[PDB]
């Protein structure tokens, strides 16, 4: 389960998710990839589900790149507490994903296999996505 080895601050602002992705909008390492059409937090749990789904269908053939890394911590308060008395404790890790971001790339399989592997992974993610090719 991906998370950073250390972090400077354990509790961060949630921030905002306006705009298209700054970078990573083209398939760069792989041949094929899956691109975000919508903005969302993607949890490290969702990245592992998506990774496994595509990797199993490829039969561990070829090669998968995970282009997002869940670096941003998010907090939650304990169940049933009142508001205030300091920020909640660190809960998990997310990657912020804006429209245009290529999330995964695949190489070393056919386009037919790539399409299906990435379709399967798409259903694990909380965003709409499009299959993309390198140029």
């Amino acid at each position: 389960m991906l998370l950073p080895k250390r972090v400077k601050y354990r509790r961060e602002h949630r921030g905002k998710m306006r705009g298209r992705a700054k970078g990573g909008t083209e398939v760069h390492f792989g041949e094929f990839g899956i691109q975000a059409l919508e903005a969302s937090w993607i949890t490290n749990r969702q990245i592992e589900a998506a990774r496994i789904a595509m990797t199993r269908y490829m039969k561990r053939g070829g090669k998968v790149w995970i282009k997002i890394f869940p670096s941003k911590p998010y907090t939650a308060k304990p169940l049933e507490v009142r508001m205030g008395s300091g920020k909640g404790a660190p809960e998990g890790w997310v990657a912020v994903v804006k429209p245009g971001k290529v999330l995964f790339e695949i190489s070393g399989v056919s386009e037919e296999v790539a399409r299906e592997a990435l379709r399967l992974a798409s259903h694990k993610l909380p965003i709409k996505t499009k299959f993309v090719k390198r140029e």
Binding site: P78, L79, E80, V81, R82, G84, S85, G86, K87
Partner: protein
């Protein structure tokens, strides 16, 4: 109606804001003594007829017109020039 116990924060402190920055505009007439800029360190340097106080305050040593101006490549100064007389 039950109420879950809650913790505490170890934060909640901050010093008084120190009202730093520019106190007179470029092109404004000042009297001698007028504080031009309050700062930590030399964000801006003393130029012509300007002094640097013990806490890095820049002040006019004469009456005249304030000019903030580029000081070489990376730095800035502020100067005071006498009026045309």
């Amino acid at each position: 109606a039950s109420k879950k116990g809650v913790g505490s924060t170890k934060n909640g402190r901050d010093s008084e804001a120190k009202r730093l920055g520019a106190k007179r505009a470029d092109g404004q007439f000042v009297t001698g003594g007028s504080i031009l800029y309050r700062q930590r360190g030399t964000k801006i340097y003393p130029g012509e007829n300007v002094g640097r106080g013990g806490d890095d305050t820049l002040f006019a040593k004469i009456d005249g017109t304030v000019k903030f101006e580029r000081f070489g490549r990376d730095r800035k100064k502020v100067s005071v020039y006498p009026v045309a007389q």
